[PDB]
Design a protein around this ligand. Sequence first.
Ligand code: SF4
Ligand code: SF4
Ligand code: FES
Ligand SMILES: [S]
Ligand SMILES: [S]
Lengths: 629, 629
Amino acid sequence: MATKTSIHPSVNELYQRLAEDQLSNCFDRFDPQEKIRCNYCELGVSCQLCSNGPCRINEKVGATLGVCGINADGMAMRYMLLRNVMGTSTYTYHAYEAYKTLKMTALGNTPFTITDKDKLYQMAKDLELNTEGKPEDVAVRLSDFLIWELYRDYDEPGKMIEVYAPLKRKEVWRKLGIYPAGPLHELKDAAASCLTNVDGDYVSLATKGLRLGLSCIYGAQIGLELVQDILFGTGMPHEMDVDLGIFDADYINIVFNGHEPFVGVALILAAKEAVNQDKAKAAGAKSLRIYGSIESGQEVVQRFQKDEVFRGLTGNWLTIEPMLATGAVDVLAMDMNCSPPNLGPLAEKYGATLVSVSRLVRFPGIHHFLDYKPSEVREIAQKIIDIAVDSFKNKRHGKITPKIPANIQKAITGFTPEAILKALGGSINPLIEVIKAGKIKGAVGLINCTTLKNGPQDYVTVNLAKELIKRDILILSGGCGNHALEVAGLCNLDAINLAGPGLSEVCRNLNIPPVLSFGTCTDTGRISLVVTALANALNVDTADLPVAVTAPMYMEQKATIDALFALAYGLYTHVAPDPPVMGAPNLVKLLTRDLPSITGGRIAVGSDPVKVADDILAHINDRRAKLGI
Amino acid sequence: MATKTSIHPSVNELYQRLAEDQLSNCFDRFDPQEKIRCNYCELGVSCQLCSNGPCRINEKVGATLGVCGINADGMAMRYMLLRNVMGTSTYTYHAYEAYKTLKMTALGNTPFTITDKDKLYQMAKDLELNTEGKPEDVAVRLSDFLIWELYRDYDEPGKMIEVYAPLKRKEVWRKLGIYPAGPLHELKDAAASCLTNVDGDYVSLATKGLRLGLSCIYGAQIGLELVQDILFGTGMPHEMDVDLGIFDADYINIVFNGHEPFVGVALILAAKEAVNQDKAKAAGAKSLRIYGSIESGQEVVQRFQKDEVFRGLTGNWLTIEPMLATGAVDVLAMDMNCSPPNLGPLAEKYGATLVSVSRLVRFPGIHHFLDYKPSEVREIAQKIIDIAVDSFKNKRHGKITPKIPANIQKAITGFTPEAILKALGGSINPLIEVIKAGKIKGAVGLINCTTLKNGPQDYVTVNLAKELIKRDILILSGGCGNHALEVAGLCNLDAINLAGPGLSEVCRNLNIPPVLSFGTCTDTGRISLVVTALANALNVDTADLPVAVTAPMYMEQKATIDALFALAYGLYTHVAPDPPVMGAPNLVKLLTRDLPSITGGRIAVGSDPVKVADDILAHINDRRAKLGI
Ligand code: SF4
Ligand code: SF4
Ligand code: FES
Ligand SMILES: [S]
Ligand SMILES: [S]
């Protein structure tokens, strides 16, 4: 087959139904695009930012510069920066909603509560906040403080970056002048820099991208993830079911899909009410069940158990169209990306009802708009159930043939920095010792999406992970790439048998898998806490550690903002497919060759799993040599 | 040559020097681009937002949707929304700096003062602020309030929109649900919506664009322009010199260029110090002179007189390269767009020194970086003078042959709402009366850039303005298009005789030109105060008034965000060249034909001055007919 589908049997089975039903889908839509691909855009050397365009760089025809005078390096880095404003904006949006949700929870107007009170008070103490009064008082103060971090300008010093970044990185960032403003001002400044005839200097634009990455992690991601832990618990390792075989067509099936978990949690709470299970049964269903999809799903499985109501995680974004083709979904409730914009016809064909639960998410054919507000989430969740009951009765049951693949996989979800320390007996030292001894050569942060650009869904990701663990490299994973490895079975104890000799031994002694599910791409900041702990304990800089990052099937700028962060944090950062920059030679030289002398990090490229793994291992072994281990 | 150059003889003369010197320039760089133009990008039906791209819509080869499933209408509107995040960000950036500058002025830390105290106290009264204490105390409170407007989230009601918008518009916006958040949250929400697999609904994306336009005018532009008036005075009509003949090579010549006028004002104040003049003469110059370029220059000519130090306005952004070829500039001090990124080689050839005065502005070959802070602007201005004296002595004097064109034109600058009321005897009603009587058919806000896309520099703008005034349509102008009309002589009393029978007679009796210079594209909000005053005087909605807007040589999203505002405000809004949307037929239908039933406004297109003017007049006459006049 000349059409890239998927490495996953479940998805290929459902692709077959979409094709038989003659429904458009991402896999098939790839092929027409291949007839007329623009190589200028592929290489980053086109521009559409003003009316003197559209421009292209082509020296042979005399088009060395854009009409305005910008060169290829400035052109490519500027559009990268602009797109990364979108990525930073999504993290900033999510963070603000988390903080408003914590505040309104403390004020009594949500179905949530303060669950991890120890984290709330420890964070408050680390931030030098007033901890007098009751937990609700402290939660309000924390929320307002973290909103201030979002809103801080160019000239007001941050506190989160001082608490959560390692010492030696701080001196690098001070020398380079890249301590960022809060993400709201930083993304506004970056967007303003990208307007025509403002910032046309590729070095400056790259520096602004590194600042944007730092602003996202310290100014949005770390606060939002810890606040979600305060609300919903800090994840600990537990068994979860994944893949599309978790569906049972005889139940009313509600799937929540996005990045923000608030609606999902509210749905689980509501579905556990006897009145709602009775509604489902009165409608002819066996009972009512909730399923998580993509990143919102992963947020929930990190912190919640499988039970009779919540059934597990469906898969990553390229599984959404196949998932509708099961003919088993009653409501798909969509809160952020990825909610692909041609789902309308598929929902109609397979008898599913689409519900947007964010003002961000709109596309043709959505039936219902229930935009999120914390004080309304209880009522939103109940309305979704009511919609699902009616949909089951009148759109799906007795009308739609279900086609649910048998594939279910088990994954150990819920690794957090706290889970790792517990597994090691309360200190990071045992991990340091197994690294020094060479049992584990190093560790990789796999922080990734999925795409079709460089292979069938998840092909590069899964095979690269297998090659890394064979080389005794431990993986901490987040994002759609984490869902892929979970579905592929790399996150359970059976996966120990795929690891090399040193990592297999450590995994068996600690009773952990060789791939540790750390959650979402929003958890890049949290993963940095583990790397920071290693750097602080060894008193070496992050750039000196035997680690690397890979986003090997990146799709959009949630992943690239995490890559820009990784570069600023000093790390070897592999990205595939190539970002649109390869036509800008001085920018390529900066990112791939010169950044080691600037931040310590560098971009690495390629889609061959074996070569990429060998290059990562070579970098790790170079770091090991310099450490004398 | 067949290269599109300019309608201005001065620019054409200096283009010849650039060409003879074989220096790259915008005019010549247009031609290579014309060889390889992408029609997908021209029509808005390409996409580069994720790794599954670059995508193109071409139904003839089966590429009906992007890989993700988005259609052509969603694709085109989404990229328009993303680019307009940049436009909004630049206005928000400027507003924030204006508010910090007012605050730091009130605290005594700048070379500025509170000039228009009446306006300060009137704003405080209208906004229900505390007016106790001294004017400086009130200025601090106003600054903090206007910063709050910048930061307001989507769920907190704004006050500027209540005070400064008319009753019926507020009702329409309420009914449509398009009351925006503050511009910081609104631009973050817009950017997040544009990430792949978030908002792919062209109608929703267009609605978000309308909201973004409203947020920009009420949340940034009106506040910033009124605060600039508080600091530097409210413009009143006065005679100004324009065009490139204002230079004299025997002086030390400092040009400020951008949109934010703070550095330019500080430079004028410093240049008036006798000590600095003495320094210039000791260096061999006759004295030290300051000149304004583009929008920063226009802000200053609106409010300041020509004198021995401040000499006037050079022209719009396509004049910057020609200006350097005069061989008369000692420092070009650049604060924002437009600062074209290949000026370095031109500055080197012609003996000028480039200084960036904003962290936004970077490009190859800049000599000095003096990022603006209010408390440092006195030191910044003095350092620029010191740089300029050294540059005159070492780079230019006796080394560079000047070639200053002879052309100088007179313009009456400084029209504001206050100036119109004064010219009418204190009330708007005499203008209403001559409009009702048919002497003036209606009024157009010409809010525009300049570009080469649809003609030689300023060709469409000037010829359209001539056709409009011939049809007895009064013009209120802002932007690079206003600079064009000043240089072309449409803004002096001689231009009365270019107007039609009714408008010429009215202008002769009132002693005003038929084109009233209202300043910058940042003054769209201020122009809306005049249109709002007309709506209130006639007791009708803005969509019912005999007015229109035109951006007839738009370049980037400072202009398009004003056009989006104008559509939301209910106006016929002509834009040329075509924005990149014409390949999206449903989006075109929405913007050009269905919006009148939604907001009342519509987009109009075309670059033929006679046809565009006839279409504007036909809309105005339709509005007149429905008003009974
Ligand atoms: S910003 Fe420069 S390179 Fe981009 S379209 Fe405009 S003229 Fe061309
Ligand atoms: S967002 Fe959609 S249309 Fe744009 S490049 Fe990605 S797949 Fe193609
Ligand atoms: S699709 Fe237009 S330049 Fe690439
Ligand atoms: S990601
Ligand atoms: S403009």
